[PDB]
Design a protein around this nucleic acid. Structure first.
Ligand code: FES
Lengths: 162, 175, 18, 101, 38, 82, 222
RNA sequence: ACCCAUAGUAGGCCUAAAAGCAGCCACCAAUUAAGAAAGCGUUCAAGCUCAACACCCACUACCUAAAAAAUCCCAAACAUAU
């Protein structure tokens, strides 16, 4: 990877770029014919929001996603890994990939509400004051429909609406 | 700001459209007149001249003028006073390759073609295309007798045009 | 409430001939 | 750049672009020259110099910016992108203006 | 804002963003173009 | 009172001189050099309608420039009503 | 180095003398006297008329059944004539003028007392019919915009189609009927009265094969 | 998406004037390339985009878009063990 450093000395600023150590794909992918990193390692349909060892390899130090052209992911798996990282952040599973805070700002405290499988941004959802009849019931989404094709080891498929 | 307007030599007037444009930008019209008419003394009055008023701080204007429009050149060289009303259906003039070649020699001297340093053939190609829009057909060789015959027929067609205009005025009178 | 009209088609009451 | 033309080269006084075009890591520095050489950007401040110190010695490309206040900005473009330079360059223009006033 | 079921950019500075769970049209040039998803 | 300037109309003169080429009052209407004094390609110039794509060579400049104009003609046409 | 491609040439297409859509009258020339039954079967099921292109290259395809009244023709005409290029485009009607009489009773009347009086006229349209046909020196992109506007304002589901999009639309439906991996199809079950299913089906369902429900067409059904 | 824009010429005709952009016809030429012009514009002007050139890949998925009533929401819940 590549860094950028700005050092100001004697009213003079010097902006440079250094090349740091770079990781490399582990040798012998179980499926070298795979197109994207996922299919090359027989990982399609086999990861979830809690598999951070996988998800942490496709995000920036501050929790942002990395571009598809750089990672090489298929457009499809990019959307799965993108949703999975959104949910992993909201589950408190990426406690080091936190947003950069300018000028040492100390955020005001928030209520701790543990959560998992959170499809929507918490501040963006309204209360369900009128649940509606049983034949038109306003449901609560759980998980993501992007992961519907994940391998299900139970005879019942994932329920995405509670 | 560069002001572009094809004006006639020595006929600058304070009235529109020249006036309002100059006044809006603050350029003195009287100052323009004093310079223009003096700079247009050796040129035949009434000649359509593409001008280029290089207005610059503070309202300084260098009136650089180029060769007359190629429309003028061709229309005058064909002996007609107006252009074709519907070109492609009405041939209002005839010229030879020699007439076009010599007009190119004068028009190539214009700053527009001179700055491109193009061969004369390229400029000649431009004249032919511009001619086909004015109704003038370029011919390889034309005799004085061939032009006289056509001109006689051309008078008949031109005369009938006047009568047609009167009929249109009657219909416009009701509207 | 509203005065209504009447059908203008009479007859047509014969039964099938078997 | 659009933001660079809107902001202008007002505070800048001399911009020197040095590179060895026969090298393989000057594309960013050569791109930096293209954007600043525009009639748009140069017009914002005609006095502001734009020099092209083309060399062939092997030194990494450099961009030297001299402000009217006397401050200097040195961007070593060997491992920098043109976009990174223009964002950094615009930041100093926005900064030196506030420092003076 | 005007509430709209179909959001249409009216210009070239009119940009589409999703905030608060719905789509918006914000235009800094022509504020009269601002739309809200209904 | 305002009209266009004078137009020469003498048939023979019109055919013996390039009228209007003299723009200087003292200048003289330019007589026409003879055939020999002109290059051969002048009489090989295309005085008719432009060559079509079939007539043009697929490896020539004019061909592609003509094709480009047609592509632009279309673009304008299919955006007129958008 | 953009790769230019040839453009189609419109030298094999002539424009009719009257490219615009003619005016459509509200009611027929001679008024009808005999009042007619409701006859709702005339917007039910697939169309067997005006299902193919004749002169032009683009059209509005009806994706459902319904009745066109005069207000629809006025909307079709003014929108098409105002939006077409008369020099390079022509437009022909593919539906007849309103001919089916529609009766209404006086306001506030009770049931009974004989049938009501003829009120207006309509034109029945079945799904799969061309409503209006266009052609000329244009591509589909040029007309698709405002043909979609008029189609969206029709009393049934409709869509602007081309000589080509119509064909691929039909190839896709036949492709689906062939690669359908479901061993159970509506037709198979309903033709064999499997499960005694005809106790809930119409006789018409033997030919509609589950693609039609009243006047509605379902292009997803195979 | 990013960029980028010179030139015969304000093509004639029409019109008080029309200059790419009233309406009329025609739509050829310059340079590697830029429509007698697609959208905006004005004083008919000028201006601002788009279509070209150059650099060179933006990523573009697939079709899509909604809601309100009156006593008090309405089982509780749940994405994971064949
Ligand atoms: S998972 Fe194989 S193409 Fe993306």
């Amino acid at each position: 990877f590549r860094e950028v450093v700005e050092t100001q000395e004697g009213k003079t600023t010097i902006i440079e770029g250094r090349i740091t150590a770079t990781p490399k794909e582990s040798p012998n992918p179980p499926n070298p014919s795979g197109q994207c990193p996922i299919c090359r390692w027989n990982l399609k349909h086999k990861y979830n929001y809690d598999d951070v060892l996988l998800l942490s390899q496709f995000i920036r130090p501050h929790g942002g996603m990395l571009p598809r052209k750089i990672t090489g992911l298929c457009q499809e798996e990019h959307r799965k890994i993108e949703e999975c990282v959104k949910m992993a952040h909201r589950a408190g599973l990426l406690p080091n990939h936190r947003p950069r805070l300018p000028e040492g700002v100390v955020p005001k405290s928030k209520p701790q509400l543990n959560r998992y499988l959170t499809r929507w941004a918490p501040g963006s959802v309204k209360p369900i004051y009128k649940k509606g009849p049983r034949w038109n019931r306003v449901r609560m989404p759980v998980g993501s429909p992007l992961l519907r094709d994940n391998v299900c080891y139970s005879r019942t498929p994932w329920k995405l609406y509670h | 700001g560069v002001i572009r307007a094809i004006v006639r030599a020595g006929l600058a007037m304070p009235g529109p459209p020249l006036g309002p444009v100059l006044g809006q930008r603050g350029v003195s019209i009287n100052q323009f007149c004093k310079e223009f008419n003096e700079r247009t003394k050796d040129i035949k009055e009434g000649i359509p001249l593409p001008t280029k008023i290089l207005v610059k701080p503070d309202r300084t204007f260098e009136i650089k003028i180029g060769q007359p429009t190629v429309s003028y050149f061709l229309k005058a060289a064909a002996g007609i006073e107006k252009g074709a009303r519907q070109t492609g259906k009405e041939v209002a003039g005839l010229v030879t390759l020699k007439h076009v070649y010599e007009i190119a020699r004068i028009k190539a001297q214009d700053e527009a073609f001179a700055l491109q340093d193009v061969p004369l053939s390229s400029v000649v190609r431009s004249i032919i295309g511009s001619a086909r829009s004015l109704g003038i057909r370029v011919v390889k060789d034309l005799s004085s007798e061939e032009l006289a015959a056509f001109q006689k027929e051309r008078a008949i067609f031109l005369a009938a045009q006047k009568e047609a205009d009167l009929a249109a005025q009657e219909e416009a009178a009701k509207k | 409430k509203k005065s209504g009209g009447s059908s203008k088609n009479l007859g047509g009451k014969s039964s099938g001939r078997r | 750049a659009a933001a660079l033309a809107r902001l202008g080269l007002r505070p800048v006084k001399q911009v020197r672009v040095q590179f060895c075009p026969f090298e393989k890591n000057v594309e960013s520095t050569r791109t930096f020259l293209q954007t600043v050489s525009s009639e748009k950007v140069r017009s914002t401040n005609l006095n502001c110099s734009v020099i092209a110190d083309v060399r062939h010695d092997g030194s990494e490309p450099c961009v030297d910016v001299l402000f009217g206040d006397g401050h200097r900005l040195i961007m070593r473009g060997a491992h920098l992108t043109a976009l990174e330079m223009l964002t950094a360059f615009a930041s100093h223009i926005r900064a030196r203006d506030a420092a003076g006033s | 804002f005007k509430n709209k079921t179909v959001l249409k950019k009216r210009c070239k500075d009119c940009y589409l963003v999703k905030r608060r769970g719905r789509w918006y049209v914000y235009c800094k040039t022509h504020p009269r173009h601002k739309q809200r998803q209904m | 009172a305002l009209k266009d300037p004078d137009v020469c109309t003498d048939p023979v003169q019109l055919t013996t001189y390039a009228m209007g080429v003299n723009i200087y009052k003292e200048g003289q209407d330019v007589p026409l050099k003879p055939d020999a004094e002109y290059p051969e390609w002048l009489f090989e110039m295309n005085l008719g309608p432009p060559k079509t794509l079939e007539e043009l060579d697929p490896e020539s400049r004019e061909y592609w420039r003509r094709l480009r104009k047609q592509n632009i003609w279309r673009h304008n046409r299919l955006s007129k009503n958008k | 180095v953009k790769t230019l491609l040839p453009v189609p040439s419109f030298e094999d297409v002539s424009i009719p003398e009257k490219p615009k859509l003619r005016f459509i009258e509200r009611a027929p020339l001679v008024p009808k006297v005999r009042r007619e039954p409701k006859n709702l079967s005339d917007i039910r099921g697939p169309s067997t008329e005006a299902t193919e292109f004749t002169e032009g290259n683009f059209a509005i395809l009806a994706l459902g059944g319904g009745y066109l009244h005069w207000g629809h023709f006025e909307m079709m005409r003014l929108t098409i004539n105002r939006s077409m290029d008369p020099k390079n485009m022509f437009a022909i009607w593919r539906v007849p003028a309103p001919f089916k009489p529609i009766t209404r009773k006086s306001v506030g009347h009770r049931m009974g007392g004989g049938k009501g009086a003829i009120d207006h006229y309509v034109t029945p349209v079945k799904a799969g019919r061309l409503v209006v046909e266009m052609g000329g020196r244009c591509e589909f992109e040029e007309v698709q915009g405002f043909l979609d506007q008029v189609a969206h304002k029709l009393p049934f589901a409709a869509k602007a189609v081309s000589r080509g999009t119509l064909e691929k639309m039909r190839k896709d439906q036949e492709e689906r009927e062939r690669n359908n991996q479901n061993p159970w199809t509506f037709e198979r079950i309903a033709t064999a009265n499997m499960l005694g299913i005809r106790k809930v089906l119409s006789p018409y369902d033997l030919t509609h094969k589950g693609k039609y429900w009243g006047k509605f067409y379902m292009p997803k059904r195979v």
